[PDB]
Design goal:
One of its GO terms (molecular function) is anandamide 14,15 epoxidase activity. This protein is α+β, with helices and mostly antiparallel strands and 456 residues long. Helix content is 48%, strand content 9%. The protein has a five-stranded mixed beta sheet. A three-stranded antiparallel beta sheet has the order 4-10-9. α6 runs antiparallel to α7, α7 runs antiparallel to α13 and α13 crosses α19. The structure holds protoporphyrin IX containing FE and the ligand COc1ccc(-c2cnnn2-c2ccc(-c3csc(C)n3)cc2)cc1.
Length: 456
């Protein structure tokens, strides 16, 4: 099927047999999407092994795929590798089964239900401050990945199951051990193989091989059973078991798999984005000072932030949004075409993966002035409405966007406020001023960001 885009009159790199264009992934997903956009223009296609992938960049065409024709045509993402019982997760559920899961879990992420999570989240904001002050009063350079990763674990554990632990200073607890335990290696030899060898995916399903290590899942599967046995609470687990008794209902095996991806998504993202924010704040002290001035103005005398005060901080929203533009951790948005459909004057055949290159759009000079720079002023209210909502898609769009968007934004902002209320961050020895992105399948820096923490 290597002649598809040739017959459709769609440009793209010439694919090799059995490999497609995966050899061009040697500079990471980010660099490959940039070069193809510059060479082939608005629309191009390539191959991940035998799988044809059509990249679209027209905002009207993006809206049709992600919003207008989401339920009818572009409903599911590309099939993942061996998942086992995790096939019931909402992030990989398909068609009607996903629609049931999305509706059953939508009330869990309401703005009203998010308010009640602020007191628990803010509880570990001060825990993070104490962990930073112990490393700041000693003048030790701080790897943000460890402290922010510790903070994100504390928020996820308490918000999901109510478990209250200082993961940074309790790495030996049985709960933190399994949750941290995970293979963190999309361009790893495994995921590169299943691209060339998608036929081997059902092989590993019957072998009971899962991308999730079976030790962690069995611990989490058994742990949730004990918590349900114990069953006021306002955490994710209660909010889902409450929906069980409340359109069909959620099974206790679905409930476990549903909550696992919340930890999956909540843990790695939050910490990674927070480190990306702090690198920019360290390399741009003027933004950090202006953000610190705003944080102190809304919250005098280092006042504890609440749900309402965070949403008032406009520059904090600008700082978060601009960092997400420079570093869209998804790097891509994908939908599988379910049928022969003509959209925006173009024929997309069945089974093709339609891809939206979020990274290549976020740095396209056509839509962003000096895209390679860090300019929070792009998202000021004066310049805010000139941004097309289908070019800047940090959390996706349409019915299948990031369901935990508001929680994640609240969690990171509550973290930034408490940290910036008490500390200022400056570059250190190994700051790596030209921050290099990892050439792998994950949007992370080549080397972990290390900075100096000074007590105000
Ligand atoms: C920095 C934080 C985060 C970012 C930048 C982010 C971004 C994204 C993106 C780009 C998608 C794909 C949407 C698309 O295909 O159109 C997504 C999906 C998703 N995210 Fe997040 N996300 C974040 C945090 C979280 C958290 C903390 C949770 C936990 C509840 C979460 C849960 C999900 C789920 C469940 C999906 C799948 C949606 C579906 O298939 O129905 N995300 N996220
Ligand atoms: C490990 O680095 C990441 C973790 C989570 C996310 C993330 C953000 N928003 N969603 N999300 C996500 C991604 C994949 C799954 C997944 C893979 S396999 C399975 C059953 N679920 C679930 C959630 C992004 C990067």
């Amino acid at each position: 099927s290597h002649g598809l885009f040739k017959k459709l009159g769609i440009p793209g790199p010439t694919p090799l047999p059995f490999l497609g264009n995966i050899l061009s992934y040697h500079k990471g997903f980010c660099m490959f999407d940039m070069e193809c956009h510059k060479k082939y223009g608005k629309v191009w296609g390539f191959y991940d092994g035998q799988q044809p992938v059509l990249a679209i960049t027209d905002p009207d065409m993006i809206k049709t795929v992600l919003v207008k024709e989401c339920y009818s045509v572009f409903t599911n993402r590309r099939p993942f590798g061996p998942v086992g019982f995790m096939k019931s997760a909402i992030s990989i559920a398909e068609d009607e089964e996903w629609k049931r899961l999305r509706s059953l879990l939508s009330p869990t992420f309401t703005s009203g239900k998010l308010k009640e999570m602020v007191p628990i989240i803010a509880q570990y904001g001060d825990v993070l401050v104490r962990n930073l002050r112990r490393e700041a009063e000693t003048g030790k350079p701080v790897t943000l990945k460890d402290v922010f990763g510790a903070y994100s674990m504390d928020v996820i554990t308490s918000t999901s199951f109510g478990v209250n632990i200082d993961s940074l200073n309790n790495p030996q607890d049985p709960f933190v051990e399994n949750t941290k335990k995970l293979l963190r290696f999309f361009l790893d030899p495994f995921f590169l193989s299943i691209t060339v060898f998608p036929f081997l995916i059902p092989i590993l399903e019957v072998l009971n091989i899962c991308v999730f290590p079976r030790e962690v899942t069995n611990f989490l599967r058994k742990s949730v059973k004990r918590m349900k046995e114990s069953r006021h609470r306002v955490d994710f687990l209660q909010l889902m078991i409450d929906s069980q008794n409340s359109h069909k209902a959620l099974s206790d095996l679905e409930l476990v798999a549903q909550s696992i991806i919340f930890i999956f998504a909540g843990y790695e993202t939050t910490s990674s984005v927070l480190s990306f924010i702090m690198y920019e704040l360290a390399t741009h002290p003027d933004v950090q000072q202006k953000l610190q001035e705003e944080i102190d103005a809304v919250l005098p005398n280092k006042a504890p932030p609440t749900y309402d005060t965070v949403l008032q901080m406009e520059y904090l929203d600008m700082v978060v949004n601009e960092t997400l533009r420079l570093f869209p951790i998804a790097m891509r948005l994908e939908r599988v075409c379910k049928k022969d459909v003509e959209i925006n004057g173009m024929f997309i055949p069945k089974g093709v993966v339609v891809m939206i290159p979020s990274y290549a759009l976020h740095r396209d000079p056509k839509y962003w002035t000096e895209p390679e720079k860090f300019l929070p002023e792009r998202f000021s209210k004066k310049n805010k409405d000139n941004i097309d909502p289908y070019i800047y898609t940090p959390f996706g769009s349409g019915p299948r966007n990031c369901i935990g968007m508001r929680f994640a934004l609240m969690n990171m902002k509550l973290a930034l406020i408490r940290v910036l209320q008490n500390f200022s961050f400056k570059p250190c020895k190994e700051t790596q001023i030209p921050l290099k992105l990892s050439l792998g399948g994950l949007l992370q820096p080549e080397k972990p960001v290390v900075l100096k923490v000074e007590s105000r």
